[PDB]
Structures are given as structure tokens and as C-alpha cells.
Subunit: 261 residues, 6 copies
Amino acid sequence: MLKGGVIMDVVTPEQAKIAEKSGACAVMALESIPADMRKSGKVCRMSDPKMIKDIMNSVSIPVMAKVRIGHFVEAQIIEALEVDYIDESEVLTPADWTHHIEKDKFKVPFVCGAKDLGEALRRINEGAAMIRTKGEAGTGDVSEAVKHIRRITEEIKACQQLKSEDDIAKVAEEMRVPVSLLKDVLEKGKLPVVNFAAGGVATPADAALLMQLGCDGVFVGSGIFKSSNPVRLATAVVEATTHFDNPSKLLEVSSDLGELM
Amino acid sequence: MLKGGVIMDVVTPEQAKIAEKSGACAVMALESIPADMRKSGKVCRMSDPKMIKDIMNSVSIPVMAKVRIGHFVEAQIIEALEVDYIDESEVLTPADWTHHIEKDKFKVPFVCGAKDLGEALRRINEGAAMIRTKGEAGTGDVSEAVKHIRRITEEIKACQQLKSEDDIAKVAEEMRVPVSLLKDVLEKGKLPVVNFAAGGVATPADAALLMQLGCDGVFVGSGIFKSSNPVRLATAVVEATTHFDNPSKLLEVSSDLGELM
Amino acid sequence: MLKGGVIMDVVTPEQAKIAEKSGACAVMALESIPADMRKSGKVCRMSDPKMIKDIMNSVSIPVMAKVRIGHFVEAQIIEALEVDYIDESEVLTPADWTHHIEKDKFKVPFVCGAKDLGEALRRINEGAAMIRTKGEAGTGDVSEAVKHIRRITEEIKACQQLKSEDDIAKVAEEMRVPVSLLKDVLEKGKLPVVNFAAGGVATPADAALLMQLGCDGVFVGSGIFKSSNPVRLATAVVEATTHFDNPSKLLEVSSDLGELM
Amino acid sequence: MLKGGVIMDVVTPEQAKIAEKSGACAVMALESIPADMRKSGKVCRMSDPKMIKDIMNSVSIPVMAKVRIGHFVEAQIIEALEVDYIDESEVLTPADWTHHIEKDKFKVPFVCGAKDLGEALRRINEGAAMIRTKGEAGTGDVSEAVKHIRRITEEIKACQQLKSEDDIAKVAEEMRVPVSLLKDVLEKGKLPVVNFAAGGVATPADAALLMQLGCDGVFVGSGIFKSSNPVRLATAVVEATTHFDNPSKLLEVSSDLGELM
Amino acid sequence: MLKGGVIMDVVTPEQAKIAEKSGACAVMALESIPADMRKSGKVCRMSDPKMIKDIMNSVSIPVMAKVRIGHFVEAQIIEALEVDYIDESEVLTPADWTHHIEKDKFKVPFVCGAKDLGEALRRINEGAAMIRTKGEAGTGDVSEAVKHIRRITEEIKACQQLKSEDDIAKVAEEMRVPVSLLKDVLEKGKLPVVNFAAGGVATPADAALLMQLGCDGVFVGSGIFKSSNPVRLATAVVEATTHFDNPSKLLEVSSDLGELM
Amino acid sequence: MLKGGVIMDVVTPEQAKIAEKSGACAVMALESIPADMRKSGKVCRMSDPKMIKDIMNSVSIPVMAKVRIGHFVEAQIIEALEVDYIDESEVLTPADWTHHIEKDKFKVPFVCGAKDLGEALRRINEGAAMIRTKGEAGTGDVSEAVKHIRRITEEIKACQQLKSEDDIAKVAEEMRVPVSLLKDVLEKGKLPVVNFAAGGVATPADAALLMQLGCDGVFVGSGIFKSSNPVRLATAVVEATTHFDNPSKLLEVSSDLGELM
Ligand SMILES: Cc1ncc(COP(=O)(O)O)c(C=O)c1O
Ligand SMILES: Cc1ncc(COP(=O)(O)O)c(C=O)c1O
Ligand SMILES: Cc1ncc(COP(=O)(O)O)c(C=O)c1O
Ligand SMILES: Cc1ncc(COP(=O)(O)O)c(C=O)c1O
Ligand SMILES: Cc1ncc(COP(=O)(O)O)c(C=O)c1O
Ligand SMILES: Cc1ncc(COP(=O)(O)O)c(C=O)c1O
């Protein structure tokens, strides 16, 4: 559905239109770039619903919004607003350092970040409909996202090497998830939900790299709109994500991209 | 009496009138924002009784005032002034690092902060009429308040898991409170007094979040009056605290709030 | 004699007159505020005898002067000057880090600071006629003074719990004082000399707080004269010290005090 | 082929022409000096293919381009561009902190850095066609490059001292390479591929020093073009690399070189 | 001879004349205040002999000069200059951190600093004709000098408590001095040479304090000449040193001294 | 040949002429004061051969030049230039942190620094023709040079105390030198080559001090030429080095030297 797509962060209706025209499969509405806020020491929260609504009114692709980790009231509000997806985001200032939102009590689907298999499974267990890497937001450095997708893949493989079901159960207990969840992953060799790349995806090559590592899609941040040519960069990232294993196409969209970050 | 209400910090009579009009159940008189003072290294004490009295004269809702931890003479003075409640506040510069005020020797009711069950019970044992979270004053970050309310709830539940009354008694001894106090809490599953949210409540969503977590009311700080639209923000926070489990109402009051913190 | 009184630091003859008019029981002559000097890294010594004499000539209440810890020659000079009391003061730069002055070889009475029971007893043993808390000079934070008076009281009570006279004697040896001194304190439940509050007394409430904690009088520093209304503040502190147990009187003198510290 | 040659970093077509005229055996195309970028905290990536192509069009010697460690999509793009060599470079911001590129799946040859024998063998095992020291890029300090070439030589000699084939196999396992690779190196006393000097080569003397230590060629950085006389310096470095064992020639090219770094 | 006298640091012939007129028993010639130099990180050495000679030519009291610890050539030079005393001074930058000068190979007498009994005895053993405290030069804080004179006195007394000659010999070995030296001290209850106070003597009271603690004389530094009234201060210090146990005289010279340090 | 002489650092032909006229036995050509460079973080290398040659052409005394530690190519170049001595200098930025130059493969004589006996012997073993202390270059503080000459002397004496030739051999092994080298030193009681003082020699007295400590000559740095009177200072240092045991001569040359460092 969003599979194979690019979700783009947008801070205005006009940015959302550019995203849509470029071929984004969805847009992530936010009033403020948390990266900048974060480096300011400011508290970053759910965006003003009126701003999210102005973005929803400007495009016909799905709209996502972020809430603070554990902030189930921000989520209730965003859900009442009828956004299509809620990102329970570590990029905003966490509201609860112990508990994430009980996502399975909502009707709107959530995406959650994960750095490893344990995290991914706990998030899924809590009700996440979609997982993404945590990467390193606002840095334009793809290596954190790469590290997370590699780690989840590696841990899955390592768990498949355990030949005892008791050992498996002990791993599940350590992860704080139902053994049946872990066992399903080990049989299928993959998470039961889509896993998107997010955080530090700066170039078309970065996007294609994460797709080739096995991501189902990519989130790109506000860097797109700080580049000297946002429409061209946005379009190139979408093309790279679509044609992620076509080197000549990747060469063609990467050429003459102009000034980035 | 204040249950389900919002108490607002005010530094002038005109701010108190705004609080009253907005639907605040009470006002907390202070001559100086301790948050700013604190970051200045200044010593923050009881406010000048004349400034408190000017606030008392300007509204008909109850008025609270702060005194330094352990400062029983500041409390005697505030009590003679006939304020309605005394907040023995960690936000002011502590006067005694060992002993809190013997609040049960006063006729005026006290509110005290607590970070966990032990602290809450010691403060109640000393005579506190009301408990509030300590949160993180002046930061606009709700996570400390959330952490405290969660911790008290968790410790209560954990203590309910003990079956040895000797174990209970050992916990009470470690907490330095009468076992009968601890036992009453374990039976009722809750503190014998109201517990308010305080410190870092910045948005209507924050206020509702703490009510849903089981708080009985909320304190909001001077951030209200630093916002670009104080009356609107104050009103929205009161509405959210009242209708804390009505998402469409929460959506409505959160929309177009203007610039905060 | 000085019991129940306020001693005020003064740096000029005119300040001494204000102190006297306000009802101070004595004045503490000093040419320089050691608090400011201290924060300058400067060495603070006995004041010039000429400045002290100019203060002695301007009032008819007793005059005190400070000497550096261990500086028995400064004390011999101040004694020859005929001041009424000598404060061997940790606020000045210590002259001897090992030995305090042999005060019992002087005719003029000394006051010494103490942070705990051991210190108080050694100072009394050396010949101090009066003890005062060490508080935290120049900070306007009363909590150090409170801590010292609480500590002395607590240690006395703890020693009263011992019932081996051998244990008592072991405590006296650790404190480096004659067992008869310690035993006298344990029987009477108090020091054999007056104990005054000093260091960080900034408000009338602070003064009364220390009296209620059991001090016999208070020293106040140069903060009085940095306030926007010195005469009013000085008078209020004297009144609070006199009527330290009268809340309505305390309320009355604390009101509309103006800008402090 | 490149053996005995100098490869020069160039950031424009005109710099590439100078390199070629000076006698460089190849040029390393990069849009930005990663040294400067690095000290800016910026992320350094593959250069824009258009800038690389403009350099390829300006000279007839081979052109190299860098990709981030582990970034196999950048490499696929550069390969499609038909550069002659790909430098998987630790000077750019690493994309994968765990896995290097699977170089043996490409047709274009790669050069990789190595600090010791283990690193060199793993890079060769992954498919590197050429090894170079990692030196210390942008510092003009030759000692890191010297350290690496010395270390590889020393480790080879130390391994040649082992006479248990089991011990050899244990070393290969620790290095994570096939024992046959390690054994080949121990028999021939050298790596199976050319080893170039790179990082911190600032003077003709530095270039010759590394050749005498056994390197097969040298990479020089953008320092060449920051000197007061680039053509002269570039020519001198090429001459020194060619006549690395001829002291009078080395003297002649080192003389009157002008202002460096 | 110098016993009971004040030696004053002087940096010019005119300062030396003031010292002489004031009643100084000797002058210490130095071209630069090492205190200021020290805080500048500068290396402080023997003063230019021409400057020392200009001072020797301006007064008829003895002149001293400083050399760096261990710098026996500076001493040979000063000796050839015919100064009356050489101060091997820790205030200058040490030339030898292991060995002091072999003073007994010179004809001119040396003064050396000591912080404790061991140091004093080693210096005497090396040939020092006179000992002084090290104090804390340029600080105007007398407490270091007090500490050293107290420590030497205490260690002497403690050694007199040893009733075994073997124990004594073990102490001497630890001190690295001949047992006969230590034994002479223990019998006489004092050092075999005069011990002067030096470092941080700022007031007449300070000078008299050190005399009453048992010093045989005092060194005062350049602080004298930075005071608002050098002649008056110099004269007062000499009088205090002469009449060190006459309190009314000490009172008289300490009065109206003007601005110090 | 240089024994009993002063070698002076010079940065221009005119400075070299001054050195020559002053009686320097040799000059040390360098284009830059490494002391200043060092404090700038800059990399300091062999000087441009053209600047060295211009100095060689301006005087008829021997000329030395520095090369980086381990930089045998810089040495080959300087050797081809026909300088008289090569200083393998820790003052320049080391090129090899593991290996010094194989100096016995050169025809030109080398001087090397040493801090202790082990270092001196390894440098002699490698082929050094002359040893010098390392001192502390550019500081004008003679104590490091003093420390090194003292340490070498002390270690020689300590080794002479060993009676076990096996013990000797064990020391040689720890030092990484042939036992015959160490044994020759122990018999002769001295190094088999001249040992010069270097680093921090600022005054004529310093120079004489090091000669009396047993040095065979002295290196002085660029401090000479920063003094207010270079010719006078240079001449005084040469005279002091020549007449290093004549106090009245030392007095005469030390007088009225003007402003140093
Ligand atoms: C950024 C971030 N990641 C992860 C978590 C929690 O993940 P988990 O509970 O699985 O350890 C939190 C909260 O502590 C968080 O703020
Ligand atoms: C912020 C704060 N919390 C708590 C306390 C004390 O709480 P308790 O006595 O339960 O440890 C203090 C001072 O004593 C305090 O300053
Ligand atoms: C401020 C102060 N209080 C107390 C002491 C001495 O107190 P006592 O010796 O009793 O520990 C000194 C320490 O040297 C001191 O300077
Ligand atoms: C610069 C650099 N060298 C080497 C490595 C990898 O080398 P190896 O895996 O062989 O240790 C990496 C580490 O992640 C690296 O970034
Ligand atoms: C200031 C100072 N005091 C003392 C010494 C040496 O004294 P002793 O050798 O007795 O330890 C030195 C040198 O180390 C010194 O510089
Ligand atoms: C200042 C300095 N001293 C000494 C050395 C090495 O001396 P050794 O090999 O004897 O340890 C080095 C570099 O290797 C150095 O930089």
C-alpha cells in the first residue's frame, strides 16, 4: 500500500504539493523540524492540528503526523483529526520514558522506530502496524539506518540458529514479547509488518541502498526542502526508491542534483 | 474541592483575574518565576505577603502560596495571612535539607511534591493534605510528571504483590512511615489524599494525559502567560482538564493555540 | 545580655547608627564585606583599628570585631583597642589551619563558629564565651545555619542515648575535649554557652526560624544595607527576633519589605 | 600499471589537467575536500557524477572516485559511470560500520585502505584490487602512513616466524580470512596486490620515503593545490616518486619548493 | 646579627633606601617580582648583577640576592659579586628538581626555605646558614608560613618523644640526614641555625605573630611597596618585629595603615 | 672539533653571520622556529634546502640541519646538500614513532637527543656521532636539560654498582643495546661520544652550569635573537661556555645583558 514508496516530511501545504507531484506515496505533516528544535534544546510535541489539517486539505495522498513516545492523548487527538497514520516518534521529546502507547487500542495504524529485533517485536506487540529504522534524524548520515536494518536482519538469522525451543522462549522472555511472535518471525525469516528506512536518507543512492538492504520503503526528512532544487531532489529520491536495483537509472537520477544538505 | 481543577501560577493581580475568568479552580501567588530565578542562581523564598495579599484581593477563588522546604516560619506567616493552601515547594530554595515542615501542627492545608511512593507517604505522614508530582518546573517537558505518577502507581501495585505483612512492615520501615499508612494505601490501591499533576504541563494534551494517568487535577506554571495568547491557552487547559477523556473536545481546544513556550 | 538580640555587621559609623536606632543589641565592625573579598580571592584580615574605633565612637551599644582563625596577635591588638567581643571568624582568611586562638588567655570574650557538637565543644574548651553557627556568609541562604543548629541538637540527643560512661569518654576523646565538658552538655541537654544563628539570615522569617529552632540570638550581615530600605529591614529583623513566636507580628513586619538581596 | 605512479586528488577539470601535465599516473575526482568537510562535521558522500564526468572528459589518464565504506549503491553508480577505479574511502563518512562493499561482485577494480595485516587481508578477501595505507588525510603528517606500512611489514615477518600451520590457521581465523590467503602472503613475504602510500604525503621527500619503505606508488591530496606553486610541487612529487632512490635528484626537486601546507 | 630583624625585597635603589630608613636589617635585591612573573608563566632567574650592584651601592646594610634552586653557577656569580647572603629560592624557577646547591662549598652564607623538619635538616646538611619558612610568596596570606613554623616545631617535639636511638636513626635515614644532626636538634629542642618567617607576611600583626610563634626574624616582599604608604608600612612592620610581644605598641603601629595589598 | 663550543640556531644568513662573529663553533640552519610552529599545531619538517644553502654560503663554520625523527629521506637529501651535521630532532614533528634513522648507513655525522642512558645508548647504537640532552625547546627553562644530564650520569653510576655481568647483560637487553656498548660505558664511566647541552639554555650562567655538569658543549636556540641585544648575548654565551669555571669572567659577561626571553 505504502510499500515501495517514499514518505516525505513537509512543514507547509506548498511543500506537501511538491511531495505529491514528485510521486511521494504519503506525506508526514510537522510544524517544525524537530532536528533544529532538538539542537535548540526546545521541547518538540505534536504539531498544531490546524496545521496538520491544512496539509490534509492540500493533497490527496495519505497524511501522517507524529506524537511523542508514550503520549496517548496526543494520539487520541490526531486520531480524532482523521490523519491516516500516526508516527510514535523518538524525534519528538518523549512523554513517557517507560511505556509506549498501547497502539492496539486505536483504530488508526501506527508506525514505530526500532534499532534491533527486540525493539521491533515489542513495538509490534504493542500494536505497531509498521516499523521503521530509527536512523539519525536531521544528520543526512545514512549509517545509523543501515546499522539498524543490518542488526534486525542479523538477529533474526542468529535466532534461526537456535535449535531449541526453550532457548527461543528464553530469548522472547528477555525481549519481553510472546514466544509466538518471536517464533513467527523465525519461521518467516522476516518481521510480520513492513519495515521502512528512516533517518539520514539524504541522496537517491541512500534510498536505493536501504531498499537493496531489504527495506520496504523510505522516509525522507526536511533536508529535501533545504536543497537548492527540492522538486528535482524529491523526484530523484522517488525514482531511486522505485528503480532501486537499476544502476543506469540510479546514475541518471543522481546526476547534476545540485547542492544538498 | 479542587478535584478536577486547574491551579494556575500568577505573578500579578491581572494575571490572577485572567486565571479566574478562564475557569481556574485556584491561583498560586508568586512574585517571581522560580524557574528564571533558579537559572540565575538566585535564592528563591516565600513571596512578599503584600504581593500575595494584592492577589487575594483580586479574585474570589482560593489562593495558594509557596514556602521553602522546611521553612515553618514562612509557613506561619503565610498562615497568618490567611491564604487557602500552602505549597511546601522544591521549586524554591530549600531551607532545611533534612526536615520538612511539621504540617499537621498547622490549620491551613499543605500541598507537597513527591517523586515516588515513599516520598508521598512521608509527606502525608508529616501532615500534607494534598500531593502533587514534582515534575520539572519551567521546562515545559511533561515526562518528569508522567514518570512520577507512573512510579507511585507502580510501587503501589508492587507492594500489593507482597503477601508477608512482615515484608510490608519492612517496606514501611524503609520508607520511614507507620505501617498502618502503608497498609491503608495497599488496601485502597491509592493514596489517602488527592494527587495533582505538576511541573512541565505545557499543553491541553499534557493536562488531559495526566488526568487519564489518574491525577486528580493539574498545576500549570507561568508558561501560560508567556504564550502569545494567555486567555486562550488558559481556557484550553481548563477545558482539557475537565473533558480529559473526550477526544473531539480535546481536538477542538488544541487547535490553533498559537505560539507556546 | 546579648541574649535575644540581633548583632549587625556595619562598615561605616552611619551604618552603626542605623543598627543602633533599629534596636540592634550590638554591632560587628568590619572595613570590608568578606563575602565580596572572598569572591575576589583577596585575603581578608582584621580591620584597621582606626575604622573600628570610629564605629565604637559612634554608638553606645557593644562593638565586636573579627580576627582570622588562629591569629592571636590580631586578637591581642583588638583587645588592646577595647572592643567588647572578638569574633574568631572563618569568614576571614584563616591564619592557622591547625590551631585556633587560646581564647582563655584573653580577658575580652570571644565568639566562635561551629558546624557540629565536636566543633562547638572544642571552641568552648579553648575558651569561647559564645558559639554561633557557621552558616554560609554572604549567600542569603539560611539552610546552612539551619543545618548546623539541627546537627548540634541531634548529636546532643544521640549522645544522651549512650549509657556507657566509657562510650561517652570515647566520644569525648574522638572530639578531643575533656569528658566533663561532654558530660555537662549531656546532662543539661544544651551547650554551656549561648548559641547564636549566623550566616545566611536574610529575612525576618529566617531570623524567627532560627530562634524557634533554639538559637539565643542572631547575627545578620551586610545584606541588610544592600536592601532598598535598610532601616525598615533592620527594624523588621529585630522585631522578628524579639517576637519570634508571634505569627501575626511576624506577618506584619514581613509585609512590604521591598527589594532584598 | 599504476605501479610507481602518483595519483592526485583534483576538485576541478583544470586541476586534473595540471595533474596530467605534471606526470600523475591517475587522478582522483572529488567535488569537495573531505578533510575540510570532516572538520566541519559535514557528511561527505560520493561526488556528483556530473563533476566526475567533467574531470573524465578533461584528461586521458585513468580517473578514480571515492564511495563511502559499505555504500555499494554509490559504487554501482560510479561503476555505471565508467570510472577506472573506485576508492572505498574512510575519508568519506562511512555508510556501513559493519560491512564493507562486496567488491568481487563488481567489474571495476577497487582500492581500499588498511592499517595492518588483518585489515589488508580482509579487504583483499572482499575483492580489493589494490591496498593503500590509511595515513591521516588532510594533516600533511606522514607518520600515520609510515606507521601502517611498517606495521603490515612487521606483522608479515612475525607470522613468518610461526611454524605451526595450526598457529597460522588460528591467526587467519582471528583475522577472519581464508588460511590460504594468509599462507600465500607468508610464503611470498608480501601482499598479493600493490600497496600504495596514502594520507599525509606532503613533500617530495615524504613520497620517496614511502617508496623506500616498500610502497608501490603514492596518493597525494589537495594540499598540492593549496601550495604557492602547484605545478612545481606536483612535478616534484612525481619526480621523487620515480627517482625515489636517487638522493641528488631528490635534493634537486626539493629545493626552492615555496610555501607548502 | 640579622636576628630580630626585617629583610625587605627591593626592586630599585630608591626602594632600598626606604627599606634602610625604615630600619630594615637587610635588603633582598631582585629585578622583578617573581610573584607577578610566576603568574605570567615566565621563567624567573638570578637578577642582572648590575641591578644587584646598584642596590649594594645605595645602602650600607647587608644585601641578599636570590638564585634558582640547584643553580650553583648563578650562586658562583652572585658570590663573585660579593653580596652578603644568597637565598636559594623556590620563588624563582628551579634549575635542578633533584639537587640543591652544595652550599658548604661556598664562602658566602645561604638562606634556604623549608616546609618541615626533614627539609630544614637536609638544607642545613647541604650547608644552609639560615632557614626560612616557604610560606606562599606574593599572596599576602600568612597561613602557609604559620603552617611551616608550626610543623617544624611539632615534628621536633614528636621526635623528642621517641625514646629509642634506633628509632631516631631510622627517622634520620628517612630524612636523608646524619643522625648526629637530628640528635643535636632533639637535645637542643631547636634548629642549629636561625629560622626566619617568609612568604605572605602582609601586616605588622602578621610579623609579630610569626615572632611569637618562635621565628628569629621576618622577610617581607614587594607588597610593602604596593601599599598606599610604603614608608609607613615598612616602619610599622619593623616596629612590630622589634616589639613583637607589646600589644599596645602593636596597636599603635597597626592603626591607620592605609590601603594594603 | 666542536667540543667546548656553542652551536646557534639561525633562521637567516644575517643571523648566521652574527653567530659566526660571536664565536659560535657552528650554526644550526632552520627556516622556522619549531617552538612557535609547535605552539601553532603546525607540522614542522626539514627546512627548504635552498634556505639551508643560503646559510651555508654565508659563513665558514660548520652548518647543521634538522630532520624529523625516522625521516631517512629528509636525511638523504640534507646529506646530498653537504651540510656538516644532521640533527635528528624531536623538536620537529616525528615521521616515524617507532624507528629512528639508521644513521650508520650515512656518511654525514648525526646528533641525537636523549633523556636517559637507555636512550643515549640506543641512539649511539643506531649510529649517532653525538648526543645532546632533549631539554625543553623554546621555554628558556634550563631544568629539563639539567635533569637529563643528571639522569644519564646517575644511571651510569648505578650500573657501575652492579657486579653481576649477567645483571649488566639484563640491563642491556632491557635497553635494547649490545652488552659490549653498555660495558664500555661502565668501564670508561662516560658515553663513547660527546654529550652536548640543548633545550632551554637562556643565559650565560645556564651555559656554564651545563658545562660544569659535564656537558661537552651547548646548543642555544632562537631566544638569542629575540633578546634586545643579540650580538651581546651571543658573545656572552660563547664566553661563558669557554670560561665555564671562571666566576669573575662569568660575572663580567652576565652583567648588563639587557632584556631576555
Ligand atoms: C528513542 C527511544 N528508543 C527506545 C525507547 C524504549 O524502547 P524499549 O522499551 O524497547 O527499550 C525509548 C524510551 O526509553 C526511546 O526514547
Ligand atoms: C526536591 C526535594 N525532594 C525531596 C526532598 C526530601 O525528600 P525525602 O525526605 O523523602 O527524602 C528534598 C529535600 O530534603 C528536596 O529538596
Ligand atoms: C572554618 C574552620 N572550622 C573548623 C576548623 C577547625 O575546627 P576543628 O579543628 O575543630 O575541626 C577549621 C579548620 O582548619 C576551620 O578553618
Ligand atoms: C576506517 C575503517 N577501517 C576499518 C574498518 C573495518 O575494518 P575491519 O572491519 O577490517 O576492522 C572500519 C570500521 O568500521 C572503518 O570504518
Ligand atoms: C619548592 C621546592 N621545595 C623543596 C624541593 C626539594 O626539597 P627536598 O629535596 O628536601 O624534598 C624542591 C625541589 O624539588 C622545590 O622546588
Ligand atoms: C621525543 C622523543 N623521544 C624518544 C623517542 C623514541 O626514543 P626510544 O626509541 O629510545 O624510546 C621518540 C619517538 O619515537 C620521541 O618523539
